[PDB]
Design an enzyme around this catalytic site. Sequence first.
Site, PDB file in Angstrom:
ATOM      1  N   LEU A 199       0.836  -1.189   0.000  1.00 13.19           N
ATOM      2  CA  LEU A 199       0.000   0.000   0.000  1.00 13.19           C
ATOM      3  C   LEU A 199       0.876   1.246   0.000  1.00 13.19           C
ATOM      4  O   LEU A 199       1.965   1.258   0.579  1.00 13.19           O
ATOM      5  CB  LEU A 199      -0.931   0.022   1.216  1.00 13.19           C
ATOM      6  CG  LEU A 199      -1.903  -1.153   1.337  1.00 13.19           C
ATOM      7  CD1 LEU A 199      -2.574  -1.153   2.699  1.00 13.19           C
ATOM      8  CD2 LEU A 199      -2.943  -1.105   0.230  1.00 13.19           C
ATOM      9  N   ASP A 200       0.393   2.293  -0.664  1.00 13.20           N
ATOM     10  CA  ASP A 200       1.099   3.562  -0.703  1.00 13.20           C
ATOM     11  C   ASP A 200       0.570   4.487   0.392  1.00 13.20           C
ATOM     12  O   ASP A 200      -0.351   4.149   1.140  1.00 13.20           O
ATOM     13  CB  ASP A 200       0.970   4.204  -2.083  1.00 13.20           C
ATOM     14  CG  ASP A 200      -0.469   4.449  -2.480  1.00 13.20           C
ATOM     15  OD1 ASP A 200      -1.335   3.632  -2.106  1.00 13.20           O
ATOM     16  OD2 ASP A 200      -0.731   5.456  -3.169  1.00 13.20           O
TER      17      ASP A 200
END
Lengths: 128, 171, 63, 459, 88, 55, 99, 174, 56
Positions: free
Chosen positions: E42-43
């Site tokens: 995930l960013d």
Amino acid sequence: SFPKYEASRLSSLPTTLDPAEYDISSETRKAQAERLAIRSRLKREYQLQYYDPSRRGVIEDPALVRWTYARSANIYPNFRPNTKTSLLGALFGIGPLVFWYYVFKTDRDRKEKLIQEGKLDRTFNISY
Amino acid sequence: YLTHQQKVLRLYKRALRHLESWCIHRDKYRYFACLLRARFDEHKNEKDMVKATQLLREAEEEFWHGQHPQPYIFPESPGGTSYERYECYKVPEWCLDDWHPSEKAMYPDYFAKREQWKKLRRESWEREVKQLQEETPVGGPRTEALPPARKQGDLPPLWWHIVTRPRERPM
Amino acid sequence: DKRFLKLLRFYILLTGIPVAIGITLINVFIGEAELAEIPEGYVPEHWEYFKHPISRWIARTFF
Amino acid sequence: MLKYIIPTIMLMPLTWLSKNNMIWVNSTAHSLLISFTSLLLMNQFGDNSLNFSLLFFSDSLSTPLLILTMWLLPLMLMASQHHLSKENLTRKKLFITMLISLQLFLIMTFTAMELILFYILFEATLVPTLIIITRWGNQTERLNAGLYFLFYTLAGSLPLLVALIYIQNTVGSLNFLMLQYWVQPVHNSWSNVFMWLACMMAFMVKMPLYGLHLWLPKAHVEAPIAGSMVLAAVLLKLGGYGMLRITLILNPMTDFMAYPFIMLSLWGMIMTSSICLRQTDLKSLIAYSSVSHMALVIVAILIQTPWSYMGATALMIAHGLTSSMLFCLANSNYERIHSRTMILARGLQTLLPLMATWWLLASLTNLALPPTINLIGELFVVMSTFSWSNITIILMGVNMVITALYSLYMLIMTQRGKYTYHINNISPSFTRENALMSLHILPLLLLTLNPKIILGPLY
Amino acid sequence: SDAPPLTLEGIKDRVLYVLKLYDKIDPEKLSVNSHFMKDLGLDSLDQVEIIMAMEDEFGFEIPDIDAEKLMCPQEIVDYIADKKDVYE
Amino acid sequence: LLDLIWLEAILPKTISLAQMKASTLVTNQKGLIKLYFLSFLITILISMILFNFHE
Amino acid sequence: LRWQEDPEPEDENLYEKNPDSHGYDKDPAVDIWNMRVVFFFGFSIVLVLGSTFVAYLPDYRMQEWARREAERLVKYREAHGLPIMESNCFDPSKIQLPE
Amino acid sequence: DSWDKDVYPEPPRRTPAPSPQTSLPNPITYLTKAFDLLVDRPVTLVREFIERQHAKNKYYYYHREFRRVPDITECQEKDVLCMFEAEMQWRRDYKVDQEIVNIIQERLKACQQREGESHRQNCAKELEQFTQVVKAYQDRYHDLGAHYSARKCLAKQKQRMLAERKAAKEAAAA
Amino acid sequence: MNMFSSLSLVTLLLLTMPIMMMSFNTYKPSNYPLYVKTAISYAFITSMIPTMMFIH
Ligand SMILES: [Zn+2]
């Protein structure tokens, strides 16, 4: 499209619309890092006394003493009778006194003149 | 200060929070929540820093023009309807030192254990001062982050007023 | 703070209650006076021109 | 007045001949008996005043001032016990002697029937007051404060001395009773203009009048607690008492000579009340509130109406108990945090619950919350000044608004909010402090039930 | 205020319950120490939405100075425990 | 402007300043006999020429 | 140093050595007797009894007399048809105008 | 009984008799009885007990009377002994006249409440007596000042008499 | 009038009773909120008696 924001002394410029924030150069970085040094340096001096377990009293703040002194005892020795002070000191000190004098003198003269002529209603006036 | 990464994430959180206020309903917020996310993806991996800062600068102005005049605020957040409501019930721990001995007779276990904490703080103070003098540079601290306890049996420096603070619901 | 209020209450009532009890009795078993015309040839003293007994006692004793 | 003068003198042998550990008990116990016996002065008659002898007389104006004056000596001795605890035995007894002397000169000043006798005692109060400010002050500015308090009073007092002696040569007497029957109209000439200024400037420097008030923010702030109480409670009222007496022989010239002083007082209320909103020192805020309150007394006296004279007398008594109460409350904080800045200690309601009730009551009386005698006095002045001129309602009304602002700003800043984290020596309030405030507010709130005994001769 | 007090187990269950309802997180590999950046792909933008779902869960804001410093469900549990005086 | 500057500068300060200046003139004396007695001669002449104190 | 001076003496806390302190003195015996004189004479005598004495003053400045007198005159004035109050305070039979 | 009716007049009362036109009981009628038995009667018993004690130890107080003395008009200038007594008498008369204005004002205030919505016409007599006594009081005691005295009141009367006397000369001019 | 006057004042004096009892502490805590409510409740019925006399 988007109207430009026009600040004022009662509505400061938002930090997100401040051009100086985006223009980040090396000189500002050292400045911003230098300010954090004084703030961090001051914090430690306060914390070494705040957390001291044998300290019972008030941690004197020289910043606060300088503020009160600059507001009371440092005014006159740094005052000069120049044009700006003399004019401001006249229309704020003598101005209002003269304005109110004629406002009451004119009103009392008019009231006194009527009472002598008997044309001022004082039918039920027995409390003065 | 804030790097370019942080200045974009913070603008992203604010936009959704103000977008939430306009939409009100949950289903309609999700619709524009996704569209707002999409606009942040198509420029996610821009390489030119100048263009990156240009996009951020031109997005703040759009945010300011479209911000809700009266955004939703959490009850206990700054500006909320419950902010600082309980600061009038938060009494510090040193106030118990001045209790009359008759009052302390009503809480023997509490004040029998309170003295242990006082002894612990008193014995560990001298070491904490040393742990900071030796670990700090010649001039003075350059940051506000303290160092942890680097040895067993030693408490972290400057722990009393961050551990014994009043509860968020004192009464 | 509680201790001080107890002391304030105690000392005010220390002489307050007798005064309240004393004043109540004087008004019941002695009462005020009745306004009457001065008898001819009689010179009242300076403390006989007052209604309440305590007012008369104050004038006679101190004033 | 020998039944009050002589017992006051005997307080001096009592203090010096008492044990070393009982000077505060004997002085405080007997100073309260002299206060108790001072109620016998209330034997006033509607037509005539009390005229004990050729020297001393008491009427409905001096009587309340005497009762207040003899009621502060015990309170001043209670407030001074702490900050003189670690003091040499002899210097403590000299300190008590100065206060006793000050009372003696004060109960002879308010009763002196001959004006020149009133002048000698009116001036004799400078000596003990000056010594108290300069010897038992705490700051460096106590030496510069005494000179201002000394030469401002003497600058206007000496011209008064010449004027009084001139009157005796012309009239033939200074006995105040005689001047009620031999007074003559003051012919309008350049000679009588200056006799009016000389006869009134000594008293207007002591009120104080706006413009000549620079000595008060120094003396009150730099004096010890006992000095501030008497300075603001009884010593500012010598100016009011003098004008109420000397204005008898200045008619009709007072009808046009009063204009420059009314405008200074009417416009001085607003200037001094505004100054309080931006004061960093808590004791200086209370001092500037006395200048604003005493400006209403000046206007009431100079316009010479039955309502104004009734209002002026009540205001003087009311302001005596309220200003003294505020000085004690501020000192209570001072004896803990050892500073005068108003923003140093905050949130004291969460640490001193019962001491925040006295602050509330003192503030409410200061802003004239009815039916306190503060409002009764301040109300009677506005009624009279309205008939003098309808436009004065604007200035009186604006001063009421500003008065509530700084009265509550003092309360909110110091009592409410969050406490200062690093100040951990705020101990519980002592019985001495709680009783000290309770002997101020209670008389101030009991007088509302029978206000006629503080309404002056015109009642 | 008449509300039930929070518990460490209760906080942990609710923290994971929200993550289990996030599409970009596979429930099979979701653990109390699963790093959002290095263990779940995930960013940061998604990590911001996670915090925006935790504060709307417990109804109290997390400042952006501390919001962008929590990178695991256990850390979020500790943060709420510290800010609510949850001890047992 | 008023309480701390002008009200001080139009009465206490200016009056105080003048007395300091007037004190320096009267006291700043060289101490020479020749110049004190020369002053007596000027007083005697002025008393007779201008003010006519001798008649 | 510039001289030999004592260090600032730390403020003494009156509750450490006497938790029952009234704040009047360090000696427990003197302290308790100081509180009794102030609370007795201050409250039990000057205020409580001073209020009672003031409450029962003998007709302060003859205000009840004046009301009582005015009742007599009004009864006499209206009964005999005279004006209730005259506009001249002094009888003009004993006044001589300037000319 | 407790106050002379002439000074404090009270018009005769006229109480309409009840004329019920309904079957429902009147709650006030029951409360009036319940109040008399529970409140009025026990109060009367205590008052009768107290009033009996008073009659056992009855004593009287008198109303002081001041005989007349020469007024200010008969006093030689700068004669303190004669002025003093003349001044004290004036001050005693000042107080009495102040209470007269109170007595007449009380009448006018009692009439307005008593007459309800018809006060505009039924209190004409009370209003007129108030408009005359106020005029008399204003003439002899208004504008004297805080330092009022017999001398200034006399000075005011003589000035007015001059204007009245001078009014005749220019009034009887034709 | 003997009743209209009496009941009109008792309404006002009743409301002041809890204030007086909380100064001299001639009461007990933990029931004061329920004490004030009852005084207002009883003050409401006493004030209707004068009101009914006005409507009649
Ligand atoms: Zn201290």
